[PDB]
Amino acid sequence: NSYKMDYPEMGLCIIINNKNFHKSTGMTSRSGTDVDAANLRETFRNLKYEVRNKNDLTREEIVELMRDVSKEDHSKRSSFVCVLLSHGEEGIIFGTNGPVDLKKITNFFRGDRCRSLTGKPKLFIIQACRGTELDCGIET
Amino acid sequence: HKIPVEADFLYAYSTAPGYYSWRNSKDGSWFIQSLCAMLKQYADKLEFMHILTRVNRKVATEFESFSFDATFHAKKQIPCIVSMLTKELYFY
């Protein structure tokens, strides 16, 4: 059994692309992320998603954008895609000026807080560190 | 009849819990690179979980870090698919 994907619209694809961080954070600029954001924009355009690219957002901006997007009427939309490109730690995504809990972002789309997306796939794609460990790999 | 409020989420993380996620200064992140390629190649053919599994293989097998700093040299990455989906997802 599979999700109904033939609503009039595939859905929104929100891409949050944070490249430059406030010096108060001590986080290096994320060179190459523009290529990512553009690669993702074309990819999801070909899947028939309404793409909205957002650049260099503070933590307050992410939360407000996510809050506002979750308050839209998604009744005509099949799904929802959010892509986060940023620095991070476990459970945490960085605005340009500091950390945001990932749970805070995703809670806006929770089944009881975003009724027009209830029963519909909500995909979060997160390019961000989750710690400082390094995988040294094993030969095969 | 209710469903969980956490149902129907999928988190496609670029890397395993606790780990660094790698990025190429000129081509972009290993994960986003691999994800866009596999969607381009297979979104008309495969269910989304199987596409992300291809992404896992591509990231795991085709990328290795290069660094003049031996601490950061020759490192690997595996992405982490976290699915609370209740149904299969086809883009076609």
């Binding site: 994320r30 060179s31 190459g32 620095h87 | 670029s14 996620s21 790698w22 990025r23 290993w30 290069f66």
Partner: peptide, 5 residues
């Protein structure tokens, strides 16, 4: 293949 996020 050289910086981390």
């Amino acid at each position: 293949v050289d910086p981390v996020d």
